[PDB]
């Protein structure tokens, strides 16, 4: 296996070549491929000439576009603010669950708020081992009859671990040994035990620039509890000059480079906001030209304007290249340009500032003051996104790149410094590189605010009208019905196309669409990504009053209620003893007949297979050999149609599960409507025949029973309605436009002869479900949106009332946190 790294300079190629020799990762060989600039490397990776390079966030954005089609895959983790530990969050979530779901696992946290390595489930007496994230180590469960397992100790904190490594297992004399606090985080002030120097670090141990102090001098105050580890764009100046930020016009400037976010996007955004630059849209020429009029002479590697390359010092064709062969390229090159007095101000980020407190440099704040180097958090041009290793979108080398860097970091190879110079291959300030979420792209990595801000400098971005709802459609018939809606809507409705509901959620997140109707099984993912219900489908045929007068009180929303249905004859069966019994399920994947029962059973029995929990059962979709297909009859006109997802199975579906109950089962998992639909001689067939409703009851979660009529107070869970989701800031617009459309084209629409929202000749259930009575505004309560939309019962039964389930690999990408401003 091979990884070919693209380098942009002779200096970087030298360092990459040293790593080929010095860094021995078994099974993966590194090789180095030289190109003369950042853009030529981007093209080499797109073309397969190389596999990976490290890019500034501004180039991550440029590389994501169709010319190159690259994506970020590895980056340094960062933190925005201190958070609850994972164990304490899990305890709070599970204590907030539905108390009628009895016997749930509540985690056990220790005096630092971490998981005890041994976790136990009170109601079942089972114990198991966990990792630092509280996830079960599979195959360590022990039953109550045995003593609790022996579980390895928890991994030490960053500080205690680096203290252990520094000590090397026998004092490390003459070397820095980190000093940790009681919680095992880094003390704010650190001192070198041999040189006498002291400096400040944040809570995860990163040095604060501008704080390094030789012995005998006064130390700057170190801030405690600093968990803001985003990097900051800053403007650095010498204390021998005296201009302020608003007098930059006509000065000389050094920039890390034309495409870098700290050397271009951040300062330029501020120039534009302050109107120091006469420029707003692409009608006034390019940004680069306007900047060319502002400064008298600059070094901005990668620029074309002549005065913006005037102060660079690269020899011959190397001059002004996005490459270390231009000595003023990058953060440290821009600082060198100030230091050598080719510029009056350098634009870079806090991680390239001097570590020493004392000296001739300080920061130029945009509020027209100057502040010391260590005050960049209050004197800056914005937080900037993380930088990242990128590769082709297809990801054919992602695993090899990840494996190599994880192994090289484990072995402590010299990835992050070099004799040959600074910031070669990676930023010298980097300490660890970790894999990003597998579905991350530039949009989710940079975040919507920085992504749009960098788009804004390249094109005028016409913002879509808040008076138009772009509806996302998932198949061609839906598209065609939405084109008919658009034609009658007077421009209120437009249409977009995607292949599946998850891709619609992506389009709405990225501003390509505005709304989509989602089944229940997608709402957890939509709500985690930050969309909100705007309106919901009301399905109750018996009461039209909430549809007639909007806003009025809904007596019964009318969704299905999952129940456990048993015969009045069998009077021993209660909820708490279904184990081993024979059960009938509509089919695997059905929410009321499977997801809700499987959910409650795993919550109360340590995630035991619902296949193993019951005795013999019928649940179409299971494997024909398993005990879940034994009751499954098949087709009476024998063909093999057994345990199949069709009507060719006698026991399939809502009626079929009810069949299996009366014929040969103790319990059936079904919506509450099925019993009334097949009793009181409502079904003609011979098995139904008579079968009085009062011959059955439903099981309550508290061990009691009730007649099949009290499903509102004695069910497993009610389902929430389907919802129309949108972005939070668009909810009020979408509600207004849809309610208006509904007064025209709903079931009592004033213009319902011109168009019907809730039916179509083109297909069934297009855009909305065909039995929808109307759409009702979602009344947002002051509570967690999970609990608000699902209801506490469903949230607990299906998701353990947790925000940590991952039913879709999009969730880790769309919840990735960003380094944005306000
Ligand atoms: N009447 C009725 O059912 O309205 C449904 C409507 N939409 C939902 N998805 N919900 C879930 C229900 O949760 S539940 O536990 O009460 O079922 C709810 O009623 O709270 C509700 N939450 C809010 N804010 N409005 C409600």
PDB file of C-alpha atoms in Angstrom, residues 318-591:
ATOM      1  CA  UNK A 318       9.257  31.752  -7.454  1.00  0.00           C
ATOM      2  CA  UNK A 319       8.299  35.368  -6.590  1.00  0.00           C
ATOM      3  CA  UNK A 320       4.765  35.670  -5.211  1.00  0.00           C
ATOM      4  CA  UNK A 321       3.950  31.962  -5.543  1.00  0.00           C
ATOM      5  CA  UNK A 322       1.716  30.041  -3.135  1.00  0.00           C
ATOM      6  CA  UNK A 323       4.790  28.085  -2.178  1.00  0.00           C
ATOM      7  CA  UNK A 324       7.487  28.157   0.499  1.00  0.00           C
ATOM      8  CA  UNK A 325       9.981  28.932  -2.225  1.00  0.00           C
ATOM      9  CA  UNK A 326       8.558  32.436  -1.823  1.00  0.00           C
ATOM     10  CA  UNK A 327      10.164  33.340   1.541  1.00  0.00           C
ATOM     11  CA  UNK A 328       7.137  35.516   2.529  1.00  0.00           C
ATOM     12  CA  UNK A 329       4.520  32.793   1.860  1.00  0.00           C
ATOM     13  CA  UNK A 330       2.285  31.585   4.683  1.00  0.00           C
ATOM     14  CA  UNK A 331       1.761  32.732   8.260  1.00  0.00           C
ATOM     15  CA  UNK A 332       5.445  32.726   9.155  1.00  0.00           C
ATOM     16  CA  UNK A 333       6.401  34.291   5.858  1.00  0.00           C
ATOM     17  CA  UNK A 334       4.011  37.164   6.376  1.00  0.00           C
ATOM     18  CA  UNK A 335       5.476  37.681   9.876  1.00  0.00           C
ATOM     19  CA  UNK A 336       9.018  37.620   8.437  1.00  0.00           C
ATOM     20  CA  UNK A 337       7.925  40.294   5.904  1.00  0.00           C
ATOM     21  CA  UNK A 338       6.855  42.591   8.770  1.00  0.00           C
ATOM     22  CA  UNK A 339       9.952  41.722  10.768  1.00  0.00           C
ATOM     23  CA  UNK A 340      12.205  42.679   7.805  1.00  0.00           C
ATOM     24  CA  UNK A 341      10.175  45.933   7.309  1.00  0.00           C
ATOM     25  CA  UNK A 342       8.842  45.112   3.869  1.00  0.00           C
ATOM     26  CA  UNK A 343       5.373  45.718   5.319  1.00  0.00           C
ATOM     27  CA  UNK A 344       3.738  47.841   7.982  1.00  0.00           C
ATOM     28  CA  UNK A 345       1.146  45.197   8.988  1.00  0.00           C
ATOM     29  CA  UNK A 346       0.993  41.400   8.574  1.00  0.00           C
ATOM     30  CA  UNK A 347      -2.223  39.377   8.285  1.00  0.00           C
ATOM     31  CA  UNK A 348      -1.953  35.861   9.794  1.00  0.00           C
ATOM     32  CA  UNK A 349      -3.399  33.866  12.707  1.00  0.00           C
ATOM     33  CA  UNK A 350      -2.673  33.710  16.442  1.00  0.00           C
ATOM     34  CA  UNK A 351      -0.760  30.382  16.142  1.00  0.00           C
ATOM     35  CA  UNK A 352       1.968  32.149  14.180  1.00  0.00           C
ATOM     36  CA  UNK A 353       2.512  34.982  16.726  1.00  0.00           C
ATOM     37  CA  UNK A 354       5.768  35.023  18.788  1.00  0.00           C
ATOM     38  CA  UNK A 355       5.628  33.057  21.996  1.00  0.00           C
ATOM     39  CA  UNK A 356       7.580  35.701  23.987  1.00  0.00           C
ATOM     40  CA  UNK A 357       5.647  38.335  25.926  1.00  0.00           C
ATOM     41  CA  UNK A 358       8.155  41.094  25.560  1.00  0.00           C
ATOM     42  CA  UNK A 359       9.207  42.562  22.294  1.00  0.00           C
ATOM     43  CA  UNK A 360       8.364  44.925  19.548  1.00  0.00           C
ATOM     44  CA  UNK A 361       5.114  43.371  18.263  1.00  0.00           C
ATOM     45  CA  UNK A 362       1.482  43.943  19.154  1.00  0.00           C
ATOM     46  CA  UNK A 363      -1.937  43.537  17.578  1.00  0.00           C
ATOM     47  CA  UNK A 364      -3.923  46.006  15.481  1.00  0.00           C
ATOM     48  CA  UNK A 365      -7.560  45.776  16.566  1.00  0.00           C
ATOM     49  CA  UNK A 366     -10.394  46.693  14.179  1.00  0.00           C
ATOM     50  CA  UNK A 367     -11.936  49.009  16.796  1.00  0.00           C
ATOM     51  CA  UNK A 368      -8.913  51.334  16.230  1.00  0.00           C
ATOM     52  CA  UNK A 369      -6.835  50.344  19.277  1.00  0.00           C
ATOM     53  CA  UNK A 370      -3.688  48.271  19.739  1.00  0.00           C
ATOM     54  CA  UNK A 371      -3.358  45.403  22.235  1.00  0.00           C
ATOM     55  CA  UNK A 372      -0.656  42.933  23.363  1.00  0.00           C
ATOM     56  CA  UNK A 373      -0.033  39.674  21.513  1.00  0.00           C
ATOM     57  CA  UNK A 374      -1.719  37.573  24.176  1.00  0.00           C
ATOM     58  CA  UNK A 375      -5.015  39.447  23.825  1.00  0.00           C
ATOM     59  CA  UNK A 376      -5.878  38.130  20.322  1.00  0.00           C
ATOM     60  CA  UNK A 377      -9.182  36.722  21.685  1.00  0.00           C
ATOM     61  CA  UNK A 378     -10.278  40.315  22.136  1.00  0.00           C
ATOM     62  CA  UNK A 379      -8.280  41.882  19.246  1.00  0.00           C
ATOM     63  CA  UNK A 380      -8.843  39.876  16.088  1.00  0.00           C
ATOM     64  CA  UNK A 381     -10.413  39.744  12.637  1.00  0.00           C
ATOM     65  CA  UNK A 382     -12.623  36.715  13.466  1.00  0.00           C
ATOM     66  CA  UNK A 383     -12.289  33.056  14.308  1.00  0.00           C
ATOM     67  CA  UNK A 384     -11.255  31.043  11.210  1.00  0.00           C
ATOM     68  CA  UNK A 385     -12.132  27.410  10.324  1.00  0.00           C
ATOM     69  CA  UNK A 386      -9.821  24.487  10.916  1.00  0.00           C
ATOM     70  CA  UNK A 387      -7.383  23.405   8.165  1.00  0.00           C
ATOM     71  CA  UNK A 388      -7.424  19.868   6.856  1.00  0.00           C
ATOM     72  CA  UNK A 389      -5.794  17.072   4.847  1.00  0.00           C
ATOM     73  CA  UNK A 390      -7.799  16.671   1.575  1.00  0.00           C
ATOM     74  CA  UNK A 391      -8.097  13.920  -1.034  1.00  0.00           C
ATOM     75  CA  UNK A 392     -10.358  13.097  -4.002  1.00  0.00           C
ATOM     76  CA  UNK A 393     -14.100  13.100  -3.362  1.00  0.00           C
ATOM     77  CA  UNK A 394     -14.245   9.414  -4.417  1.00  0.00           C
ATOM     78  CA  UNK A 395     -12.185   8.590  -1.322  1.00  0.00           C
ATOM     79  CA  UNK A 396     -10.203   5.735  -2.855  1.00  0.00           C
ATOM     80  CA  UNK A 397      -7.156   6.512  -0.652  1.00  0.00           C
ATOM     81  CA  UNK A 398      -8.909   7.814   2.500  1.00  0.00           C
ATOM     82  CA  UNK A 399      -8.254   4.635   4.498  1.00  0.00           C
ATOM     83  CA  UNK A 400      -4.587   4.411   3.505  1.00  0.00           C
ATOM     84  CA  UNK A 401      -4.024   8.108   4.368  1.00  0.00           C
ATOM     85  CA  UNK A 402      -5.826   7.782   7.716  1.00  0.00           C
ATOM     86  CA  UNK A 403      -3.977   4.595   8.622  1.00  0.00           C
ATOM     87  CA  UNK A 404      -0.593   6.054   7.781  1.00  0.00           C
ATOM     88  CA  UNK A 405      -1.095   9.249   9.807  1.00  0.00           C
ATOM     89  CA  UNK A 406      -2.597   7.394  12.794  1.00  0.00           C
ATOM     90  CA  UNK A 407       0.378   4.995  12.858  1.00  0.00           C
ATOM     91  CA  UNK A 408       2.922   7.729  12.272  1.00  0.00           C
ATOM     92  CA  UNK A 409       1.507   9.744  15.192  1.00  0.00           C
ATOM     93  CA  UNK A 410       1.458   6.653  17.416  1.00  0.00           C
ATOM     94  CA  UNK A 411       5.194   6.125  16.672  1.00  0.00           C
ATOM     95  CA  UNK A 412       5.900   9.854  17.248  1.00  0.00           C
ATOM     96  CA  UNK A 413       7.327  10.550  13.758  1.00  0.00           C
ATOM     97  CA  UNK A 414       8.543  14.123  13.063  1.00  0.00           C
ATOM     98  CA  UNK A 415       5.349  15.187  11.260  1.00  0.00           C
ATOM     99  CA  UNK A 416       5.025  18.625  12.886  1.00  0.00           C
ATOM    100  CA  UNK A 417       8.420  20.335  12.751  1.00  0.00           C
ATOM    101  CA  UNK A 418      11.493  20.444  10.610  1.00  0.00           C
ATOM    102  CA  UNK A 419      15.066  21.772  10.469  1.00  0.00           C
ATOM    103  CA  UNK A 420      14.268  22.918   6.958  1.00  0.00           C
ATOM    104  CA  UNK A 421      11.706  25.530   7.988  1.00  0.00           C
ATOM    105  CA  UNK A 422       8.320  26.219   9.486  1.00  0.00           C
ATOM    106  CA  UNK A 423       4.889  24.918   8.531  1.00  0.00           C
ATOM    107  CA  UNK A 424       6.245  22.429   5.975  1.00  0.00           C
ATOM    108  CA  UNK A 425       3.676  19.750   5.076  1.00  0.00           C
ATOM    109  CA  UNK A 426       1.569  20.630   8.148  1.00  0.00           C
ATOM    110  CA  UNK A 427       1.274  23.627  10.452  1.00  0.00           C
ATOM    111  CA  UNK A 428       4.072  23.500  13.118  1.00  0.00           C
ATOM    112  CA  UNK A 429       1.424  24.305  15.749  1.00  0.00           C
ATOM    113  CA  UNK A 430      -0.481  21.046  15.000  1.00  0.00           C
ATOM    114  CA  UNK A 431      -0.389  18.401  17.787  1.00  0.00           C
ATOM    115  CA  UNK A 432      -2.777  15.668  16.624  1.00  0.00           C
ATOM    116  CA  UNK A 433      -4.700  14.879  13.394  1.00  0.00           C
ATOM    117  CA  UNK A 434      -7.866  12.804  13.613  1.00  0.00           C
ATOM    118  CA  UNK A 435     -10.243  11.422  10.966  1.00  0.00           C
ATOM    119  CA  UNK A 436     -13.249  13.623  10.159  1.00  0.00           C
ATOM    120  CA  UNK A 437     -16.828  12.214   9.947  1.00  0.00           C
ATOM    121  CA  UNK A 438     -17.104   9.946   6.938  1.00  0.00           C
ATOM    122  CA  UNK A 439     -19.758  12.057   5.148  1.00  0.00           C
ATOM    123  CA  UNK A 440     -18.130  15.425   5.853  1.00  0.00           C
ATOM    124  CA  UNK A 441     -17.595  17.803   2.925  1.00  0.00           C
ATOM    125  CA  UNK A 442     -16.386  21.401   2.732  1.00  0.00           C
ATOM    126  CA  UNK A 443     -19.823  22.778   3.558  1.00  0.00           C
ATOM    127  CA  UNK A 444     -20.217  20.822   6.857  1.00  0.00           C
ATOM    128  CA  UNK A 445     -16.494  21.150   7.722  1.00  0.00           C
ATOM    129  CA  UNK A 446     -16.297  24.956   7.250  1.00  0.00           C
ATOM    130  CA  UNK A 447     -19.900  25.508   8.332  1.00  0.00           C
ATOM    131  CA  UNK A 448     -22.599  27.509   6.603  1.00  0.00           C
ATOM    132  CA  UNK A 449     -21.439  30.943   7.814  1.00  0.00           C
ATOM    133  CA  UNK A 450     -17.808  30.634   6.647  1.00  0.00           C
ATOM    134  CA  UNK A 451     -18.777  28.730   3.483  1.00  0.00           C
ATOM    135  CA  UNK A 452     -21.155  31.502   2.402  1.00  0.00           C
ATOM    136  CA  UNK A 453     -18.694  34.212   3.383  1.00  0.00           C
ATOM    137  CA  UNK A 454     -16.070  32.746   1.106  1.00  0.00           C
ATOM    138  CA  UNK A 455     -18.636  32.264  -1.694  1.00  0.00           C
ATOM    139  CA  UNK A 456     -19.557  35.950  -1.247  1.00  0.00           C
ATOM    140  CA  UNK A 457     -16.028  37.094  -2.338  1.00  0.00           C
ATOM    141  CA  UNK A 458     -16.211  35.230  -5.671  1.00  0.00           C
ATOM    142  CA  UNK A 459     -19.755  35.932  -6.919  1.00  0.00           C
ATOM    143  CA  UNK A 460     -22.871  37.931  -6.181  1.00  0.00           C
ATOM    144  CA  UNK A 461     -25.128  35.411  -4.435  1.00  0.00           C
ATOM    145  CA  UNK A 462     -28.751  36.270  -5.238  1.00  0.00           C
ATOM    146  CA  UNK A 463     -30.633  35.331  -2.074  1.00  0.00           C
ATOM    147  CA  UNK A 464     -33.857  33.384  -2.814  1.00  0.00           C
ATOM    148  CA  UNK A 465     -37.114  35.072  -1.945  1.00  0.00           C
ATOM    149  CA  UNK A 466     -38.644  34.557   1.497  1.00  0.00           C
ATOM    150  CA  UNK A 467     -41.940  34.685  -0.427  1.00  0.00           C
ATOM    151  CA  UNK A 468     -41.251  31.439  -2.334  1.00  0.00           C
ATOM    152  CA  UNK A 469     -41.066  27.883  -0.918  1.00  0.00           C
ATOM    153  CA  UNK A 470     -38.814  25.613  -2.951  1.00  0.00           C
ATOM    154  CA  UNK A 471     -40.303  22.161  -2.302  1.00  0.00           C
ATOM    155  CA  UNK A 472     -37.975  19.163  -2.442  1.00  0.00           C
ATOM    156  CA  UNK A 473     -39.306  16.147  -4.303  1.00  0.00           C
ATOM    157  CA  UNK A 474     -38.020  12.569  -4.142  1.00  0.00           C
ATOM    158  CA  UNK A 475     -39.357  10.991  -7.374  1.00  0.00           C
ATOM    159  CA  UNK A 476     -40.488  12.025 -10.837  1.00  0.00           C
ATOM    160  CA  UNK A 477     -44.260  11.843 -10.160  1.00  0.00           C
ATOM    161  CA  UNK A 478     -43.781  14.100  -7.148  1.00  0.00           C
ATOM    162  CA  UNK A 479     -41.797  16.537  -9.317  1.00  0.00           C
ATOM    163  CA  UNK A 480     -44.658  16.549 -11.805  1.00  0.00           C
ATOM    164  CA  UNK A 481     -47.309  17.286  -9.154  1.00  0.00           C
ATOM    165  CA  UNK A 482     -45.138  20.048  -7.774  1.00  0.00           C
ATOM    166  CA  UNK A 483     -44.809  21.646 -11.252  1.00  0.00           C
ATOM    167  CA  UNK A 484     -48.622  21.705 -11.390  1.00  0.00           C
ATOM    168  CA  UNK A 485     -48.724  23.345  -7.953  1.00  0.00           C
ATOM    169  CA  UNK A 486     -46.173  25.900  -9.062  1.00  0.00           C
ATOM    170  CA  UNK A 487     -48.243  26.840 -12.137  1.00  0.00           C
ATOM    171  CA  UNK A 488     -51.347  27.721 -10.011  1.00  0.00           C
ATOM    172  CA  UNK A 489     -49.449  29.146  -7.050  1.00  0.00           C
ATOM    173  CA  UNK A 490     -48.607  32.512  -8.527  1.00  0.00           C
ATOM    174  CA  UNK A 491     -44.885  31.950  -7.823  1.00  0.00           C
ATOM    175  CA  UNK A 492     -45.311  31.001  -4.145  1.00  0.00           C
ATOM    176  CA  UNK A 493     -44.196  27.394  -4.914  1.00  0.00           C
ATOM    177  CA  UNK A 494     -41.153  26.070  -6.806  1.00  0.00           C
ATOM    178  CA  UNK A 495     -39.635  22.589  -7.045  1.00  0.00           C
ATOM    179  CA  UNK A 496     -36.315  20.847  -6.632  1.00  0.00           C
ATOM    180  CA  UNK A 497     -35.379  17.220  -7.204  1.00  0.00           C
ATOM    181  CA  UNK A 498     -33.445  14.787  -5.024  1.00  0.00           C
ATOM    182  CA  UNK A 499     -33.306  11.016  -4.868  1.00  0.00           C
ATOM    183  CA  UNK A 500     -34.369  10.391  -1.250  1.00  0.00           C
ATOM    184  CA  UNK A 501     -35.568  12.197   1.886  1.00  0.00           C
ATOM    185  CA  UNK A 502     -32.068  12.409   3.365  1.00  0.00           C
ATOM    186  CA  UNK A 503     -30.843  14.226   0.241  1.00  0.00           C
ATOM    187  CA  UNK A 504     -33.755  16.681   0.659  1.00  0.00           C
ATOM    188  CA  UNK A 505     -32.586  17.416   4.218  1.00  0.00           C
ATOM    189  CA  UNK A 506     -29.112  18.151   2.789  1.00  0.00           C
ATOM    190  CA  UNK A 507     -30.534  20.527   0.187  1.00  0.00           C
ATOM    191  CA  UNK A 508     -32.506  22.418   2.821  1.00  0.00           C
ATOM    192  CA  UNK A 509     -29.396  22.663   5.085  1.00  0.00           C
ATOM    193  CA  UNK A 510     -27.373  23.998   2.120  1.00  0.00           C
ATOM    194  CA  UNK A 511     -30.028  26.561   0.985  1.00  0.00           C
ATOM    195  CA  UNK A 512     -30.988  24.721  -2.262  1.00  0.00           C
ATOM    196  CA  UNK A 513     -34.532  23.949  -1.063  1.00  0.00           C
ATOM    197  CA  UNK A 514     -36.912  25.100   1.633  1.00  0.00           C
ATOM    198  CA  UNK A 515     -39.223  22.338   2.749  1.00  0.00           C
ATOM    199  CA  UNK A 516     -40.021  18.623   2.533  1.00  0.00           C
ATOM    200  CA  UNK A 517     -42.437  16.250   4.223  1.00  0.00           C
ATOM    201  CA  UNK A 518     -40.703  13.553   6.277  1.00  0.00           C
ATOM    202  CA  UNK A 519     -41.774  10.147   7.557  1.00  0.00           C
ATOM    203  CA  UNK A 520     -41.245   9.548  11.298  1.00  0.00           C
ATOM    204  CA  UNK A 521     -38.178   7.384  10.606  1.00  0.00           C
ATOM    205  CA  UNK A 522     -36.267  10.410   9.270  1.00  0.00           C
ATOM    206  CA  UNK A 523     -37.198  12.991  11.852  1.00  0.00           C
ATOM    207  CA  UNK A 524     -34.486  12.066  14.369  1.00  0.00           C
ATOM    208  CA  UNK A 525     -31.853  12.776  11.754  1.00  0.00           C
ATOM    209  CA  UNK A 526     -33.549  15.986  10.577  1.00  0.00           C
ATOM    210  CA  UNK A 527     -33.902  17.385  14.134  1.00  0.00           C
ATOM    211  CA  UNK A 528     -30.226  16.514  15.002  1.00  0.00           C
ATOM    212  CA  UNK A 529     -29.118  18.449  11.946  1.00  0.00           C
ATOM    213  CA  UNK A 530     -31.030  21.459  13.228  1.00  0.00           C
ATOM    214  CA  UNK A 531     -34.144  21.568  11.039  1.00  0.00           C
ATOM    215  CA  UNK A 532     -37.480  22.266  12.734  1.00  0.00           C
ATOM    216  CA  UNK A 533     -41.058  21.111  12.115  1.00  0.00           C
ATOM    217  CA  UNK A 534     -42.926  23.962  10.414  1.00  0.00           C
ATOM    218  CA  UNK A 535     -46.353  22.288  10.052  1.00  0.00           C
ATOM    219  CA  UNK A 536     -47.537  18.697  10.489  1.00  0.00           C
ATOM    220  CA  UNK A 537     -49.982  16.375   8.656  1.00  0.00           C
ATOM    221  CA  UNK A 538     -53.241  16.018  10.657  1.00  0.00           C
ATOM    222  CA  UNK A 539     -54.810  12.648   9.747  1.00  0.00           C
ATOM    223  CA  UNK A 540     -58.009  12.442  11.863  1.00  0.00           C
ATOM    224  CA  UNK A 541     -60.984  11.868   9.540  1.00  0.00           C
ATOM    225  CA  UNK A 542     -63.594  12.184  12.307  1.00  0.00           C
ATOM    226  CA  UNK A 543     -62.883  15.780  13.376  1.00  0.00           C
ATOM    227  CA  UNK A 544     -62.380  18.582  10.873  1.00  0.00           C
ATOM    228  CA  UNK A 545     -62.760  21.381  13.409  1.00  0.00           C
ATOM    229  CA  UNK A 546     -58.962  21.995  13.759  1.00  0.00           C
ATOM    230  CA  UNK A 547     -58.871  22.288   9.955  1.00  0.00           C
ATOM    231  CA  UNK A 548     -61.944  24.541   9.684  1.00  0.00           C
ATOM    232  CA  UNK A 549     -60.879  27.047  12.384  1.00  0.00           C
ATOM    233  CA  UNK A 550     -57.050  27.094  12.564  1.00  0.00           C
ATOM    234  CA  UNK A 551     -55.531  27.487  16.037  1.00  0.00           C
ATOM    235  CA  UNK A 552     -58.361  25.735  17.885  1.00  0.00           C
ATOM    236  CA  UNK A 553     -57.838  22.924  20.381  1.00  0.00           C
ATOM    237  CA  UNK A 554     -57.240  19.447  18.957  1.00  0.00           C
ATOM    238  CA  UNK A 555     -59.139  16.818  20.935  1.00  0.00           C
ATOM    239  CA  UNK A 556     -57.404  13.876  19.244  1.00  0.00           C
ATOM    240  CA  UNK A 557     -54.635  14.328  16.692  1.00  0.00           C
ATOM    241  CA  UNK A 558     -55.477  10.886  15.410  1.00  0.00           C
ATOM    242  CA  UNK A 559     -52.124   9.207  14.819  1.00  0.00           C
ATOM    243  CA  UNK A 560     -51.719   5.468  15.262  1.00  0.00           C
ATOM    244  CA  UNK A 561     -51.085   4.044  18.771  1.00  0.00           C
ATOM    245  CA  UNK A 562     -48.922   0.950  18.967  1.00  0.00           C
ATOM    246  CA  UNK A 563     -50.495  -1.562  21.391  1.00  0.00           C
ATOM    247  CA  UNK A 564     -49.784  -5.081  22.598  1.00  0.00           C
ATOM    248  CA  UNK A 565     -52.939  -7.054  21.743  1.00  0.00           C
ATOM    249  CA  UNK A 566     -53.867 -10.206  23.703  1.00  0.00           C
ATOM    250  CA  UNK A 567     -56.899 -12.464  24.107  1.00  0.00           C
ATOM    251  CA  UNK A 568     -59.201 -12.011  27.137  1.00  0.00           C
ATOM    252  CA  UNK A 569     -59.003 -15.804  27.557  1.00  0.00           C
ATOM    253  CA  UNK A 570     -55.229 -15.845  28.280  1.00  0.00           C
ATOM    254  CA  UNK A 571     -55.346 -13.944  31.571  1.00  0.00           C
ATOM    255  CA  UNK A 572     -51.810 -14.730  32.820  1.00  0.00           C
ATOM    256  CA  UNK A 573     -49.955 -12.685  30.173  1.00  0.00           C
ATOM    257  CA  UNK A 574     -48.747  -9.273  31.387  1.00  0.00           C
ATOM    258  CA  UNK A 575     -46.222  -6.850  29.902  1.00  0.00           C
ATOM    259  CA  UNK A 576     -43.430  -7.839  32.296  1.00  0.00           C
ATOM    260  CA  UNK A 577     -43.502 -11.559  31.339  1.00  0.00           C
ATOM    261  CA  UNK A 578     -43.672 -11.574  27.523  1.00  0.00           C
ATOM    262  CA  UNK A 579     -40.239 -13.170  27.496  1.00  0.00           C
ATOM    263  CA  UNK A 580     -40.359 -16.570  25.792  1.00  0.00           C
ATOM    264  CA  UNK A 581     -44.010 -16.137  24.696  1.00  0.00           C
ATOM    265  CA  UNK A 582     -45.228 -16.371  21.077  1.00  0.00           C
ATOM    266  CA  UNK A 583     -45.736 -13.068  19.309  1.00  0.00           C
ATOM    267  CA  UNK A 584     -47.094 -11.765  16.020  1.00  0.00           C
ATOM    268  CA  UNK A 585     -45.563  -8.776  14.223  1.00  0.00           C
ATOM    269  CA  UNK A 586     -46.953  -6.962  11.161  1.00  0.00           C
ATOM    270  CA  UNK A 587     -43.406  -7.108   9.649  1.00  0.00           C
ATOM    271  CA  UNK A 588     -39.843  -6.140  10.539  1.00  0.00           C
ATOM    272  CA  UNK A 589     -39.300  -2.370  10.111  1.00  0.00           C
ATOM    273  CA  UNK A 590     -42.884  -1.377  10.816  1.00  0.00           C
ATOM    274  CA  UNK A 591     -42.925   1.330  13.457  1.00  0.00           C
TER     275      UNK A 591
END
